[PDB]
């Protein structure tokens, strides 16, 4: 708190990774105050804290709407909205630290070369912020040996919407996962090299064989949904981006990176490690409660979009400029409060569709790996629990429309 980060401090942070909204740097200096810690720094596209409608939508959380900055905002969103839903056991909202404009600029330039080219094209750190978040580095087993192998999972959405507000033209959405569909669109725009083999419904099934099936699939095609770290260094997956298919070569390096930690012989350490991850995922049941919060998206976007316009007090352009008689009347007949509720719960779900899980292993919650004769303690943590902006409802609808439209045309080539 009393700590204010300056330009010299910037030499003491290395590139860890990034998503779309934040840059994350690992500590690599000496100070006893930041050892075993990571820093989360908000980005701005190339191209005050809450909008008027946002202040309205979130009125039920007074602490949240009076947040002096977007760093406090996130902190309070986790603490006062996501925790009551997820539980505090595996959730850390982090600690604020005052930062200088110069620190931000120097760290911005420092890491540039370690960033993916397309990431740099789209956004850099927001240097107008006077704040950042310090978090426990989850690739270290606990604060204050030996080796720690850490696994990050981005599960995405693990259920299927029902047809009440999905017209027959988009019927596939009720039988094919958003994840599997987005794949084709992404491949088309060259945002990935191949289609994933990961099915989120498998991971969320609560069935052990299907959870192990998902892990194997996540190993084969990690993309941006699977990362492995050895004592804080990336040994599988992409750095701030999606990575391609696991080649025999990435297979060798990772298998060999596992000696010391997993005791097998020889090229079977991978198999047993996947088993390990799979056993920790199922046995902790940490996914079940995440699914419950994803299911707060009760109506799908094709439903919720209508409530969105009532909330912003705007003549619905979907019901207008579409066929009358196909105007979604039941939704618009709702009391304001129900409409506000539905869209609030839609945003929260979107947080849960887009967050990540980090699992920390060390040799001795535990897993008894039979095929190696080892025992591993684990720790589970939810990360990347960002507040989604209200105005994004419109782009969600447009992206969704684009997803199913592209997927239909591809399927129609029968
Ligand atoms: O930038 P990417 O790695 O491709 O991932 C993005 C990104 O997620 P993260 O930033 O959490 O990594 C978006 O989030 P923003 O940073 O833009 O907030 C998120 O968008 P929403 O969470 O708002 O949906 C989107 O998710 P989706 O594509 O399901 O909308 C998701 O894309 P992928 O997970 O598909 O890569
Ligand atoms: N507390 C943490 N410990 C270890 N790694 C982290 C932590 N927070 C983030 N990361 C890593 O940094 C990356 C980006 O973090 P994230 O919060 O997902 O950024 P964004 O908000 O842009 O999506 C993640 O993919 C994750 O691997
Ligand atoms: Mg995010
Ligand atoms: Zn409408």
UniProtKB/Swiss-Prot annotation:
Q: List the ranges annotated as motif EXKPK motif.
A: 152-156
Q: What is its EC number?
A: 2.7.1.158
Tree of life domain: Eukaryota
Molecular functions (GO terms): ATP binding; inositol-1,3,4,5,6-pentakisphosphate 2-kinase activity; inositol-1,3,4,6-tetrakisphosphate 2-kinase activity; inositol-1,4,5,6-tetrakisphosphate 2-kinase activity; metal ion binding
Q: In which tissues is it expressed?
A: Strongly expressed in leaves and cauline leaves. Weakly expressed in siliques and flowers. In flower, it is expressed in the major organs of developing flower buds. Strongly expressed in sepals, petals, in the male and female organs of immature and mature flower buds. Strongly expressed in the gynoecium and carpels which are fused to form the gynoecium. Also expressed in the transmitting tissue and ovules.
Catalytic activity, reaction form: 1D-myo-inositol 1,3,4,5,6-pentakisphosphate + ATP = 1D-myo-inositol hexakisphosphate + ADP + H(+)
What protein name is recorded for this chain? Inositol-pentakisphosphate 2-kinase
Q: Name one GO cellular component term.
A: nucleus
What does the UniProt cofactor note say? Answer: Binds 1 zinc ion per subunit.
Q: Which family does it belong to?
A: Belongs to the IPK1 type 2 family.
Primary gene name: IPK1
Q: Which BP terms does GO give this entry?
A: defense response to bacterium; defense response to fungus; defense response to virus; intracellular phosphate ion homeostasis; lateral root development; myo-inositol hexakisphosphate biosynthetic process; phosphate ion homeostasis
| Required co-factors | Zn(2+)
List of residues that carry N-acetylmethionine: 1
Residues bound to substrate are 45, 119, 156, 186, 224, 354, 388, 392, 396
Chain sites annotated for binding Zn(2+): 306, 316, 319, 332
Q: Which UniProt keywords apply?
A: Acetylation, ATP-binding, Kinase, Metal-binding, Nucleotide-binding, Transferase, Zinc
